[model samples]
Target chain A: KLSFLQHICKLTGLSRSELLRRIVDSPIYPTSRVLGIDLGIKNFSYCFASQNEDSKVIIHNWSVENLTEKNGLDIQWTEDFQPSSMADLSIQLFNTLHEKFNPHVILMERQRYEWTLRVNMLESMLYALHYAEKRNSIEQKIQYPFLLSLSPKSTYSYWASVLNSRVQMVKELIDGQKILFENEEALYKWNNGEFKKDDMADSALIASGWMRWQAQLKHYRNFCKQFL
Target chain B: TVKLSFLQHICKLTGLSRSGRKDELLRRIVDSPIYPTSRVLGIDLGIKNFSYCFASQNEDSKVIIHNWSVENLTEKNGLDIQWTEDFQPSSMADLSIQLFNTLHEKFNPHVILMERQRYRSGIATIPEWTLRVNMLESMLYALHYAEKRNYPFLLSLSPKSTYSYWASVLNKKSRVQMVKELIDGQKILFENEEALYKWNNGSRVEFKKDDMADSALIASGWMRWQAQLKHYRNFCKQFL
Candidate 1:
């Protein structure tokens, strides 16, 4: 099985600009795999999803990981913890995840505040993603990967407003509709309702929100044809 | 969209002078921020010995060294990862991040001067060392970009430039000695006594001070030349 992220690490592709332009210019299509991540200092949650033939969002897999859980990393979280150590720990976590899941696109939720730990984690993710993209391009005879940073503050608010709800209320808003689960366990997990479960839902929402944004972009692109 | 030839063409079309080098042409268009007086840190990156010099320059052109030290990125004991054949990437990343963290903790520099590494590209040249330095450079750049500070600036300057500007001598040993004497003679004021004690009280054989010497030299050298260059640029600005 081609661990998609490792495959990305093994090969390469199009320029970010060119890939972005292509995605923006063309009509929305079902990507085979997409990963959305909600980063945290103590833990990180991720959701893997794709669109089915009928253009419905399909949830394939999702989970939350603590900093220490991934590698049995013995990190004591404190204000005095070295930023580099945190970043180093994060890189190891992402590298392992890259080996497990292969997603066509990666969408990371951007942190609103400029906290040191969060910033370090964000940069570590960037480093990991970039290294994979570059390495993947080499293996694939020069192709690009889709990596994007989604603004949680605005995107979550927008999604919340559209659903006639609040940010954390997404798991309830799209319970039986809008989002389809690949496994019943995932649905149960989201229904279980923990802070960790909320994080998983937020990651899921990030991916769905990205899809919604793309649809809006397409709509706006078509509407702008008259002016052109 | 504005690439090398495209950028050059734009300069030509707009009746602006273009350079053979792409960055030179780009520099003509981009307005860089100027800090009249600020804290500057010089970093000399090496696989074995990574050194840093932290100093501040005032508007009156009095430069003071606040701190200087050399750190090893790889060690068998603690504070770093032990090296192996396949452990280069992880180890390099760890070192780079540690360097960044140390910089933030010790000297939150307004300006950072990193020694641009060069690869000889021969059969004799080792690829591991090149890749290691490159990894460090990349991580530093990424870390600095994510710093969330508005005024902190990072620049990779060629070591050749600093060496040439500060010391025209071809002898490597002499250059270090010259730097030592200059510092000892109080050409540059030292505010950190711990660093000064290390400087004056150690023998050349017992202590390896070249790394520290070069690191400090680059920061003060760049500051002096940069201030002079700005003066000349301002003078030319009025006429042009």
Candidate 2:
């Protein structure tokens, strides 16, 4: 059976390339830009990367958005933070990332918990993002699925085999220059925990994991493809 | 028996035809009205129960309520599940999908009107029930848009609007009374005697099954509003 997004795209008359861009079942070329995102109440982080003709993963950019600061939501520091505010921050994070990168493929770390606050917040966020994507598609007369949610455990496990901690493994990968960073200082600050926001580092790991996983498999599987 | 050509003609006009057997064509023709009519499904979604009414307008004159019922989400089907802080979202998702699967198969509505519950922040509590309802509402929206054929339109209608348009007071009791009066006076026809009996027999206490009343009220009230707007538009078009 077709996935919900694929069925929706088919119903909405999306072009073949548009459909392929949203779903990862299609091949991802060396030049295809990919984005990995990690969402949270306090922080939202994303990384953009692609491979050269040699198929080496090249990190294009990464950032940790302080959602509390960006949304000017002071009450989030307290327990009285409203669900609507959480949704607003999420939509802002999604809209900003899409506007800035417009990547061909997107992979968001899967959230598997059902704690009431987190569940409520994520549901509203996903709802807002779905409609925002739908409205934008209609306004532009183009259509595509929104994004895929990839298993964070799997992505982390892919790298754990290669640091003392998951973060330490990412640090070693960066130090060994296995994953080329566009900026060295950004990597240094991330390692130093100047922001103490591992969400950004997680996004970088997600991106690298996606590329490496694809390269190893050498074929497309549900939401990731192996590179030639 | 009507001629096969005549049956085929009516089927063609009504946009229904497979054209193999005369029995099939006859059934199709009888099932669909040649005159312009719209099927509307109104849902009264609540924290404890879900109620729905499916109605169709006949020749743009009378509102015919075909089916309606209230289902207890917590304990129906001999299973008790409390929607507490620890409630799994997947259970709710499963219920929402199951409800739509049955609804689409039975009614195939041209339009769906769902009660959009409101929230007041003055309450000191977190309003966890409100959050769950909102999630369910959005889930239904996603399901309908992605799953349904013909891209049927769904509206998030406020209950206050339905009450205000159909009655003098914006309270549940008053709204129930309005629907009761209508059903008692035959202003809205039940599809048959069995439906009327089902409703009357179910209402043992005065307000025991208000959800059903509320669902029927929302559907009838909204259809009346649409007819009035159409009438107003037609009247103004002559001046233009």
TM-score, per-candidate, Cα-based = 0.46, 0.51
* Residue B202 displacement (Å), model 2: 2.0
lDDT tens per residue, model 1, A1-228: 224322221112111332334333544544658877777655567778887666567888776656543322343333323434444444455555556666677777545333533444444446543554455587789755466655445557656656563335565546646678888876776767325566666777777777666555554445444433
| DockQ scores of all models, one per candidate | 0.04, 0.06
Error of 2 at A217 (Å): 22
Candidate 1 matches the true fold with a TM-score of 0.46
Q: Which 10-residue window of candidate 2 chain B scores lowest in summed lDDT?
A: B77-86
Q: Tell me, by DockQ, which candidate is best.
A: 2
Please provide, for model 2 over A1-228, each residue's C-alpha lDDT reduced to its tens digit, 9 standing for 90 to 100: 246445433322222243444445444334357887776655666678886655566777776755545332222332223443344444445556667777777776655433545645555455445554555677899955446555545577657744326577777776777777666765555756425556767888787876775564342334332221
Q: Candidate 2's fnat?
A: 0.04
Q: Which stretches of candidate 1 lie over 4 Å from their true place?
A: A1-228, B1-33, B58-60, B76-86, B117-125, B168-173, B202-207
Best by TM-score: 2
Off by over 4 Å in 2: A1-45, A48-228, B1-37, B77-86, B117-126, B148-150, B168-173, B204-208, B237-240
State the local distance difference test value for candidate 2. 0.59
